[PDB]
């Protein structure tokens, strides 16, 4: 893809903010200055975080860009990135990107960061099996099915999301750094085969059960399971409850909003030592 003649920067890059970025990058003196495709070929790096950018329309004509640092902007549509075949590092933290469908020819992309975009659907990752690093913290991700296809990742961050099923990760045995803290994980069984782990984080899990009826002798089953499949005994129980394996029981003579319990168990997988820690809360009606 190539511009048909020397064209003013203003007319290639429709976003005022991104046009200025290119102008400064090319060391031109005005957004009306015409640029040749040769000058657009010479750009290999765009560092433009917190620059008020709403659109990267025009970037299609930058074949050779290898790095894109675009954190803290306002990008919603990444379609113009589709055909940047030489891009290796892409940072889009704190943007509004909610769709990765259009990343289906970034076959040299090794590092992707999409933290804090409010993303839930990550299925477009199926097009990037060569990824070595993927940062997805602070998003609204429930379904990590597609990550099973990302078998070359060594670093994967999924912290502070809405995940409870981590079975999709069982075949990612090249993983060395896995961040899973602040999710809804109560079952560690499927992480048992990740024997190359050096760093694992598993703290502050929160599990909010579906409501049950209040009653004097309240019984709630424990379903917190270790990697070996055995139940994790609660550490602390609210409202003077106690543990009658496999259930947690309370005497509640008066009505209460909610009951809960904390679990905390040290864990080892391969060379990585972690703390499987969290809270299960049971609303009453």
UniProtKB/Swiss-Prot annotation:
It comes from the Bacteria. Disruption phenotype: Deletion of inlB alone decreases host cell entry; the reduction varies from 99% to 37% depending on the cell line tested. One of its GO terms (cellular component) is cytoplasm. LRR repeats lie at residues 40-62, 63-86, 88-106, 107-128, 129-152, 154-172, 173-196. It is found in: Secreted; Cytoplasm; Cell membrane. Its main location: secreted. Keywords: Cell membrane, Cytoplasm, Heparin-binding, Leucine-rich repeat, Lipid-binding, Membrane, Repeat, Secreted, Signal, Virulence. The keyword Cytoplasm applies. Residues 1-41 form the LRRNT domain. Disulfide bonds: none annotated. Residues 206-284 are annotated as: Ig-like region. Residues 206-285 form the LRRCT domain. GO terms for molecular function: heparin binding; lipid binding. Coiled coil: none annotated. The N-terminus (36-79) resembles a truncated EF hand, the LRR region (80-240) has a curved form, while residues 241-321 form an Ig-like region; the whole region forms a curved tube. The LRR domain alone (31-241) binds mammalian MET and stimulates its Tyr-phosphorylation; the LRR plus Ig-like region (36-321) are required for receptor dimerization; adding the B-repeat allows the protein to scatter host cell colonies, and the GW domains, especially GW2 and GW3, potentiate MET activation. Belongs to the internalin family. Interacts via its LRR repeats plus the Ig-like region with the extracellular portion (residues 25-741) of its receptor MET; MET can bind HGF, its endogenous ligand, and InlB simultaneously. Probably forms a dimer upon interaction with host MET, which subsequently allows dimerization of the host MET and subsequent host signaling; dimerization probably occurs via the convex surface of InlB. Prevention of dimerization does not block interaction with MET but prevents downstream action. Mediates the entry of L.monocytogenes into normally non-phagocytic mammalian host cells. Its host receptor is hepatocyte growth factor receptor (HGF receptor, a tyrosine kinase, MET) which is tyrosine-phosphorylated in response to InlB. Downstream targets MAPK1/MAPK3 (Erk1/2) and AKT are phosphorylated in response to InlB, which also causes cell colony scattering. Complement component 1 Q subcomponent-binding protein (gC1q-R, C1QBP) has been suggested to also act an InlB receptor, but this is less certain. This is Internalin B. The gene is inlB.
């Amino acid at each position: 893809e190539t511009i048909t003649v020397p064209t003013p920067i203003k007319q290639i890059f429709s976003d005022d903010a991104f046009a200025e970025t290119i102008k400064d990058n090319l060391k031109k003196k005005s957004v009306t200055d015409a640029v040749t495709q040769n000058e657009l070929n010479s750009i290999d790096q765009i560092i433009a975080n917190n620059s008020d950018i709403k659109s990267v329309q025009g970037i299609q004509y930058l074949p050779n860009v290898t790095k894109l640092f675009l954190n803290g902007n306002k990008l919603t549509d990444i379609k113009p990135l589709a055909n940047l075949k030489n891009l290796g590092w892409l940072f889009l933290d704190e943007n509004k990107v909610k769709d990765l469908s259009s990343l289906k020819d970034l076959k040299k992309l090794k590092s992707l960061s999409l933290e804090h975009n409010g993303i839930s659907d990550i299925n477009g990752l199926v097009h990037l099996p060569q990824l070595e690093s993927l940062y997805l913290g602070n998003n609204k991700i429930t379904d990590i099915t597609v990550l099973s296809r990302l078998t070359k990742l060594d670093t994967l961050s999924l912290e502070d999301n809405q995940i409870s099923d981590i079975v999709p990760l069982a075949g990612l045995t090249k993983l060395q750094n896995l961040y899973l803290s602040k999710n809804h994980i109560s079952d560690l069984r499927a992480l048992a085969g990740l024997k190359n782990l050096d760093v694992l984080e598993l703290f502050s899990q929160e599990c909010l059960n579906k409501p049950i009826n209040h009653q004097s002798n309240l019984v709630v089953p424990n379903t917190v399971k270790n990697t070996d499949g055995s139940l994790v005994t609660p550490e602390i129980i609210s409202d003077d409850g106690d543990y009658e394996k496999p259930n947690v029981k309370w005497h509640l003579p008066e009505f209460t909003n909610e009951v809960s319990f904390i679990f905390y168990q040290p864990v080892t997988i391969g060379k990585a030592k972690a703390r499987f820690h969290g809270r299960v809360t049971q609303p009453l009606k």
